[PDB]
Design a binder for this molecule. Sequence first.
Ligand SMILES: N[C@@H](CC(=O)O)C(=O)O
Ligand SMILES: N[C@@H](CC(=O)O)C(=O)O
Ligand SMILES: N[C@@H](CC(=O)O)C(=O)O
Ligand SMILES: N[C@@H](CC(=O)O)C(=O)O
Ligand SMILES: N[C@@H](CC(=O)O)C(=O)O
Ligand SMILES: N[C@@H](CC(=O)O)C(=O)O
Ligand SMILES: N[C@@H](CC(=O)O)C(=O)O
Ligand SMILES: N[C@@H](CC(=O)O)C(=O)O
Ligand SMILES: N[C@@H](CC(=O)O)C(=O)O
Ligand SMILES: N[C@@H](CC(=O)O)C(=O)O
Ligand SMILES: [Mg+2]
Ligand SMILES: [Mg+2]
Lengths: 252, 252
Amino acid sequence: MDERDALRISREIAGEVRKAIASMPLRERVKDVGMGKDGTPTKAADRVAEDAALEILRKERVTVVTEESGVLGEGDVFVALDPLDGTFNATRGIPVYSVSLCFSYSDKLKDAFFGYVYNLATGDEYYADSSGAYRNGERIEVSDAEELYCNAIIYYPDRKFPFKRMRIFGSAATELCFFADGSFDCFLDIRPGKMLRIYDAAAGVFIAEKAGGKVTELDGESLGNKKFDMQERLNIVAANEKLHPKLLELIK
Amino acid sequence: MDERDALRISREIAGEVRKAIASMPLRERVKDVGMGKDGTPTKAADRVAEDAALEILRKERVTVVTEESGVLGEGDVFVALDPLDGTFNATRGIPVYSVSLCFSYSDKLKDAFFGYVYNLATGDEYYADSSGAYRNGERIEVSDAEELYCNAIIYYPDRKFPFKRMRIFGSAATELCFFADGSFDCFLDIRPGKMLRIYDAAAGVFIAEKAGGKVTELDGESLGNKKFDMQERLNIVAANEKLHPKLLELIK
Ligand SMILES: N[C@@H](CC(=O)O)C(=O)O
Ligand SMILES: N[C@@H](CC(=O)O)C(=O)O
Ligand SMILES: N[C@@H](CC(=O)O)C(=O)O
Ligand SMILES: N[C@@H](CC(=O)O)C(=O)O
Ligand SMILES: N[C@@H](CC(=O)O)C(=O)O
Ligand SMILES: N[C@@H](CC(=O)O)C(=O)O
Ligand SMILES: N[C@@H](CC(=O)O)C(=O)O
Ligand SMILES: N[C@@H](CC(=O)O)C(=O)O
Ligand SMILES: N[C@@H](CC(=O)O)C(=O)O
Ligand SMILES: N[C@@H](CC(=O)O)C(=O)O
Ligand SMILES: [Mg+2]
Ligand SMILES: [Mg+2]
């Protein structure tokens, strides 16, 4: 499997997940249908999204790591799949939610070869491969902001902060792309519980890095050894190379 | 002028603003075009929006209070107009932004008779009159949540908080509607600088109250004597009757 195959698979999935969710009324979407393997409830929207995705991934030699059904398959290529990221928004008709796919040649983030976040409400498509990062077919990159007085997405502000703006949209996979294309200047998830899971962030990270972002754990350690499993957890500090160290110091 | 005229006018305005913005590329939207009367830059998107609105409102015996052009007209009915709320998102292409109109029989909020917030990205329409509050022609009401462990929209969290979720979308007018239809359990703007302006909040406030929400100033003070002018600033605590007092004590 290569970055071209991945793009093809990722798009086929996006189309199906899009249809499935778009035809589903909010009263249907919001219903609890079971306990996800992640240890949180699967909403009817989650299950519908995941089924459409797994139907397609089933035909590839991959091991799938996915929120609701957990680890599936035996393949050598690993896929961190968030079938629906921002479910809470989706169940309320707030148009920030996505399907996220990160493809890796091992069970570690360092071997990623393809990242893909499709906005299910806007049809916006973000991906990155060896040729860089894209928003709807156009090369994107991160902002060149060097000042803490910038536009930040942050989970969660718990003290006074120097930022010009703070936003929290509820879809890390999508918001990481907002940072990737420069819409925002940095992305922080510094929650002490360490809540983010591999499928939430993997693609977002990969795309942000290809867009020139420096993306690291709370203390600046590499995300390379983050595992494609259900136990993995993440904090994230992501910004351009110059703003990044300033953020690291800001949160000590 | 009554509540029906208001709805008719608001819908006419919404159609024009929505068509104007949808045809406008992001690279055009984001351009600074002048300094607004509020003391912040007018973006090209702001101007296109405001001109569309004013072309329709100028045919009415109203005094208009609007972000970019300021106080206009001589009429006895006052209209707080945010021609584009969430401009930052709109320039981004992030689908949370609205046109907001609140109509009053004086220059104070207490004499409001109509509230209208239209999401320009989704086509969602929120309004309220003497018959209650609506999202897309359906009656809405606020959630009955009694616990601080709830879903909050809050500008800005500056300490540790007991909330289940925190969201900040960048359009107070729209987020006030999210609270109004119960998508969220409360809306808080507790920014010490007192940043909200009359046209950001008036319509949303009116709609929330009609949906059953209790909406006050930082100290439980009434919003009734808030002025339809450029000098007015607001903080907001908005939740149902039960949850509201708890939030009040939480933020002392
Ligand atoms: N995923 C898109 C295709 C694309 O992104 O170009 C679809 O709806 O089929
Ligand atoms: N947005 C909620 C839950 C969800 O989106 O499914 C959260 O993880 O905080
Ligand atoms: N998924 C959310 C839904 C809500 O808070 O309304 C929960 O844990 O309850
Ligand atoms: N999730 C919403 C987005 C919107 O309100 O446009 C829906 O398509 O139902
Ligand atoms: N209007 C905003 C835009 C931005 O922050 O990039 C400003 O203060 O510059
Ligand atoms: N707020 C969400 C964001 C996401 O699901 O990506 C979370 O805590 O996981
Ligand atoms: N403003 C809407 C009218 C409506 O809300 O029914 C439109 O553009 O058609
Ligand atoms: N006024 C918004 C951004 C904008 O719409 O210009 C903020 O400062 O958060
Ligand atoms: N603001 C965006 C909305 C969206 O992406 O759906 C646009 O009109 O391009
Ligand atoms: N989020 C707010 C920012 C402000 O008014 O200061 C708004 O644009 O409605
Ligand atoms: Mg779950
Ligand atoms: Mg302005």
